[PDB]
A paper describes a structure:
When DNA damage occurs, PARP1 can sense and attach to DNA chain breaks in milliseconds, which in turn activates its ADP-ribosyl transferase activity for modification of itself or other factors, including histones. The hetero-dimer binding interface was confirmed through extensive mutagenesis, combined with ITC and ADP-ribosylation assays. Remarkably, our functional analysis of the structure shows that HPF1 and PARP1 form a composite active site, with HPF1 contributing key active-site residues.
To answer these questions, we determined the crystal structures of mouse and human HPF1, and human HPF1/PARP1 complex at 1.71 Å, 1.57 Å, and 1.98 Å resolution, respectively. We also determined structures of human and mouse HPF1 alone, and observed that the conformation does not change upon binding to PARP1.
Residue numbers in the entry: 36 to 345
Write the structure that this text describes.
């Protein structure tokens, strides 16, 4: 049972559109479903789709495969689970975004990891995410034979979504309801959702604005010496004390935000403190799996060679 296998290996449930889209791709190319969109869109299905693909099967147990790292790009936060890849020149990729390991994805996000850390919303299911990508591709293609192929995939995609009841919109009602719960955008822009009660307990803002925090981070990276770097780091050390205060007052979202911003900034100079902030924040929020993902990822934060099944 590949479905049980994929959810066991990632320790995450997958939504029904994940499995329906596999079937859709099997229909497009029965022999190599994960590559059904490679020629027309330049996209390949990977990650949990590798499991559906049976790519993991040839290896003999114990393989040592770690799904926490599998197709995890450099700026993928633990919430983001890659399912589609494009060109490695930009490291374009799409992933399911989950606010909690115990909840189904709230949308499909996209990022170009060689460009920046920003995660853009691209529909709430993979049919929508591919439809929206295809629509953009339609504006760039200059060969009527290739346009014909894209129109055919578009027609099949739209009909499948209609029968299954999936919205093709970039932002759905459900996504707008989730974004109401966002307490801060973070550096990746995709939003952080943590519980906030009636008395406002659960989150507090960082004592620096995002722009000033980036200024501080840049000073750490640009520092000419260890002593210079220590002085530049001082505001971040102070913010970690403020996070300790917040944790004592149950405002666990603050440490998640600081840790996420530091991770998003991308410098290895922040891996130690990110490894203090983020596992603790996720564990306090009872999002235990995400603490394990960030521990694994910070220890092996690869720019290239993230395919555990290469």
């Amino acid at each position: 049972d590949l479905r049980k296998e994929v959810e066991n290996l990632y320790k995450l449930s997958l939504p029904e559109d994940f499995y329906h889209f596999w079937k859709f791709c099997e229909e497009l190319d029965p022999e190599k479903p994960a590559d059904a969109l490679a020629t027309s869109l330049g996209l390949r299905l990977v990650g949990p789709y590798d499991i559906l693909a049976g790519k993991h099967k040839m290896k003999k147990k114990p393989t040592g495969l770690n799904c926490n790292l599998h197709w995890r790009f450099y700026y993928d936060p633990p919430e983001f689970q890659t399912i589609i890849i494009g060109d490695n020149k930009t490291q374009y990729h799409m992933g399911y975004f989950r606010d909690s390991p115990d909840e189904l994805p709230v949308y499909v996000g996209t990022n170009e990891a060689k460009k920046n850390c920003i995660i853009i919303q691209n529909g709430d299911n993979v049919f929508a995410a591919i439809k929206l990508f295809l629509m953009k591709k339609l504006k760039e293609v200059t060969d009527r034979k290739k346009i014909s192929i894209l129109k055919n995939i578009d027609e099949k995609l739209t009909e499948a979504a209609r029968k299954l009841g999936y919205s093709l919109e970039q932002r759905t009602v459900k996504m707008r309801q989730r974004d109401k719960k966002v307490v801060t955008k973070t550096f990746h822009g995709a939003g952080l959702v943590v519980p906030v009660d009636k008395n406002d307990v659960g989150y507090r803002e960082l004592p620096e604005t995002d722009a000033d925090l980036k200024r501080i981070c840049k000073a750490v990276v640009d520092a000419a010496s260890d002593e210079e770097r220590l002085k530049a780091f001082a505001p971040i050390q102070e913010m970690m004390t403020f996070v300790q205060f917040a944790n004592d007052e149950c405002d666990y979202g603050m440490g998640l935000e600081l840790g996420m911003d530091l991770f998003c900034y991308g410098s290895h100079y922040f891996h130690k403190v990110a490894g203090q902030l983020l596992p603790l924040a996720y564990n306090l929020l009872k999002r235990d799996l995400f603490a394990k993902i960030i521990e694994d990822h910070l220890a092996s934060r690869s720019e290239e060679n993230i395919d555990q099944l290469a």
